[PDB]
Each structure stands twice: as structure tokens, then as C-alpha cells.
Amino acid sequence: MNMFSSLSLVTLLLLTMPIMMMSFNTYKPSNYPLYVKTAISYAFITSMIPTMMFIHSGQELIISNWHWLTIQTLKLSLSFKMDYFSMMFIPVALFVTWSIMEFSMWYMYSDPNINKFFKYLLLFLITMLILVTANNLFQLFIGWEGVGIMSFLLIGWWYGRADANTAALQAILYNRIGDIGFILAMAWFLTNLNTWDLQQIFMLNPSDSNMPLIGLALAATGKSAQFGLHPWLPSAMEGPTPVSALLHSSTMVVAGIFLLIRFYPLTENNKYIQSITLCLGAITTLFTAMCALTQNDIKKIIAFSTSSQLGLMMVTIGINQPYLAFLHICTHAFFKAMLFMCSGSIIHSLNDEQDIRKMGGLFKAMPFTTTALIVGSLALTGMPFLTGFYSKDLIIEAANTSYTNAWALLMTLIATSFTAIYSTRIIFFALLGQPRFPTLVNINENNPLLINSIKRLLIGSLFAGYIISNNIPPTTIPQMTMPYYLKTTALIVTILGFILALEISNMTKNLKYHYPSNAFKFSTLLGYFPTIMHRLAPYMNLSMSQK
Amino acid sequence: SDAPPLTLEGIKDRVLYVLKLYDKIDPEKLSVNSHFMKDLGLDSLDQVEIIMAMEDEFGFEIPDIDAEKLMCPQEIVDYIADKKDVYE
């Protein structure tokens, strides 16, 4: 108990101690970059001690450790919600962060402001952890903005690049829009209900919670980059790759779904939210892949490749799977973030080249890079027993074997195969074929530090996702019984994506001229949603402002 | 990215070696300062192809206006040396 709670709160305060050392003193320069990493390394250990106790005891502890404010009949505190999600989502985030931690200590050697770089990387981590552990909307709101702001600087690290300034505000524009539902939700729980503490919210079990949940639906629309407020998520790839690896691949993007899960007791009864959320992911989960089938940017493609995974997570919640969707969060983060780092290896040896068509001949010229690229893809595509398959097979269970919209299941599998399609298009140019990079060879990855970074993040997907399944205790009645094809439909359509893309990929070798096609451009040009909605809408708001 | 250094002496053959694979030139007649149109008996349309190879060779675009005047290998070296600020 005491030991469990006490040792748990150290991580949030422990992580902040290096930050307190940046605003004060000048004792030891040139060593902070390692200082932070070891703290996470140490933090991870203190993030695993709660792991043991929680699994054995399942001790969900809400700790109110202050009396901040008090209005008539309200009270705010700097409390934390030590429960399943924090105990199980924190270890993964640090694990990924720990990998990314040492990844960035090498890639950004070209930045004199590297020390500043870490002055914010550690900041975001703090806010994200506070967000998930938050017991109240307000404190939860704070993290909802910290991720919003910490992204602003990290997104726009190179403030000179016009893409950063435009993209950074594009996301901030969207990120703020999502909060409209968030602030609305607080108002409703303050008017109809009377508090922002989840204890009262769940226990009272609202009978008409359409409005508060509708705000939650909007919250995830922009923050998690769902369709309708999606375009910004790819836009983050105009800046540092390590920055994209954590914020927009593993940590910030998970915010949108997280709130719905954290309000699981309320979301169950109202199916109005479920349908639109179920449909919202449906339109997004394919619109991301449908667009992604022909995109030609290594970093953006990964963003779209991440987008579809996120788009499907909403469907997982849309099918009323509270704790099963949670797994998809951790499982996806491992490799995809590693893929960002792997994409870093490609960009490193390429000396600032990113076009997918300017890559190849890397199977043996990039042996280590080739090593982990397939696992993430195979795990991403749903290779059995791998980190991504567990969710992919499990998640498709209820959706295809429980009450769901007819059209909802339609795009559910069409894009599912597309998930593997671009992976083959990627590993093809990335690894298959003879080299196509510029004449001079800058290829070198005999860097021990990165190998440590790749080592740590290569292992987790292979084994950690498998391990994570065992310890977690029962919370649901698994639908182990279903028609064999439905149980194996993923096991049926999975191989189709590789082959179908392989059918598409190899026929392009032949020396035959090309032919334009509208759909080839509709998906390639992002469905024209960004190309249009990011011209007129700025023009409407601004060109019409003067009058 | 450790260090991608650049040296004028090392770059010397990089511009010239590009010409060493051309199928419209005798390698031995070619010189460091040889004008392409007259000394090498070439044309602007032929000269366009050489300029393009430098972009695949080194990896950086070339403006249309300044591409034409680079009729001397030294000038091409000057463009590469001067644009990247390489002096030794």
C-alpha cells in the first residue's frame, strides 16, 4: 500500500527533477543529454515496481494529495488516478521513450540547441503522464493542453522552415478545435452534474449523457487526427524525425481515444456516440489507407500508416471494447515508433533524402536497418503471435461477431488488407531492388548508441506484446466462439494484402509507359481534403475579417 | 551524420569524372578549362544533359539561368564550390 502508492508518485516528480536543474545552476554542462535519459532509465525501474504490485493486487488507487481550490461546493486538487491504465500505459511509454531517448542523443548531434531539445522532450513526457493519471477533467484538461503546446515547439523546432510554422499552427488550430468539446463536457458535468471528479461522474450514471459524450467525440476528432480534423497529423513530418517518433506516433496521438476509454461506464449505454465514433473511424480508417495506398513520402507515409491504425482504434471503441482497444495503443506504438527510428536510419545513410523512390538496395548495404523493418511491418500487418496481431485478430472478433452497422464492417476489412499493401510498397523500395540513392555513398550505421536504441525497441514488439497479454487480469468475456471464417477472416485477408500489393508492385517493373488516373491522384493527393480545406477556410476566416 | 566533408581537390574529378563517362566526348582531348561549345565541339542541348548529371551526382538542383553559362569545368567547379562555400 504505502510502498505501492509512495513509489508510484516518484516517477512524475522524479522525471521533473532534471527540468528543475535546467532553470537553475550551471554546475555541469555537456552532460545533461545523458542526464535525462538515465532518469527515464531509472524512472522505468520505478515504473516497473508498480507493475508488479498492481498485477498481483489490482490496487487501483486514487490519491488526492492536495486541497488546491474550493468553490461553494467544488474542490480541485493535484490528484492522480493510480489505476490499470496508468500502471500499464506508463511502462510502455517510458519503454518507447527510453528507446527514443538514446535515439535522439545521436541523430540531433547537428543541433547546438540539443540541450534545449531535451528541455522540451522531457517536458512533454511529464504532461502526458499527468494526463493519463489525472483524476479530474481540469487536471486532465491541463495535460490536454500541455501535449498541445509541447507539440507546438517540438513540431516547429526549426522555426525557419515555413512548413514548420504553417504545419505547427495547422495542428494547433485543429488541436484547439477539439478542446471545444472538452470545455463543453466540463460545463455539462458542472451544470447537470456538479463536479469534475470521476468518482461522482461514474457513480451518478447519467441517464441522458448525449451532450457530454458528443464533446468527447469531438475531442478525439482533432487531437487523435480522426477524419474531419485529420490533416495535421501527417503535417508533423516537416520537422525532426525523433520528435515525430514519440509525440505523433506513440504518446500524443493516443489522447483522443484515451478519454472515451477513461469514461467507459458512461459510453456503454448511449449508442448514438458509438455509431458515429464507429463510423468516424470507419471513414478515417480507410480514408487514411485509401489515401496511403499511393503516397510517396517516407515520413508522411508512416504518418498515414499510423493514421489508419489510429482510425481503427475508434472502431474498436465503437464496438464497445473498453480494455481490448487499450491494448492496440501499446502494441502499435512499439514498432511504428521503431519504424520512425528505422526511417531515421534510412535518412541518416541517405544524407537528407526522403523520397520513397530514392531508396533501394538496402538488404545488405543496410543489414541492421533491414533487420527490424520487417518485424514491425509483419507485426503491423498482423503476423501471428506478434505485437500487432493480438489486437488485430482480437479486435475484429466482436466487430464481425456482434451487433454492428452493415457499412461499418464494409471498410473494416477493405482497408485492413491495405494496411499491408503500403508496407510491401515500402519494404520494396526500402529494401528490395538495387540501390537508387545518389552517386556518393554515405552509408554507415556502425554506431553503438543507435544499436542500443534499436536493440531496446527491436525486442519489445517481438516479445513484450506477448508478455503484456499474460499478466493483465480478466475484465471481459472473450468471444472465443465464432464461425471459423470470421475467426480467421483476418487470417484469410491478411495474406491477400501482401500478395495483392505484390501483384501491383512487380508488374510496374516492366518497361511500359504510365497512364494517369483520377483515383490514382484522389488517393495520392490526400482526397483533396487538405489541398482544399487548407486554402479556402483560411481565406474565408481571413479574407472576410476586414469587413 | 558524423561529417560529410567536401574538398576542392576531391571534387575536381567529381565534376570531370562525370564527363569521363560521356559518349559524345573524347576523354583525352578534354581539359579542365576547355570550353564545351568550341573546345569540345558540343551544343547547348548537349550541355543540358551534362548539367543534369551533376544534380544526380551531388544532389542539389541548379537554376535554369545559371546552368547555361557553366560552359567551363572550372565554372562548374566554381558553382559547386561557391554554392556550398567550399574553398580548400
Partner: peptide
């Protein structure tokens, strides 16, 4: 940077280890 333990090539397979 141990003294250029890898010597880059030009139009060649990498000088790996």
C-alpha cells in the same frame, strides 16, 4: 569518430563490418 573507421566509397557497396 575514431579516425574515420569507415571510408565512404563512390558508386560502390558500403565498406561495412
Amino acid at each position: 569518430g575514431g579516425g574515420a573507421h569507415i571510408e565512404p566509397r563512390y558508386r560502390q557497396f558500403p565498406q561495412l563490418t
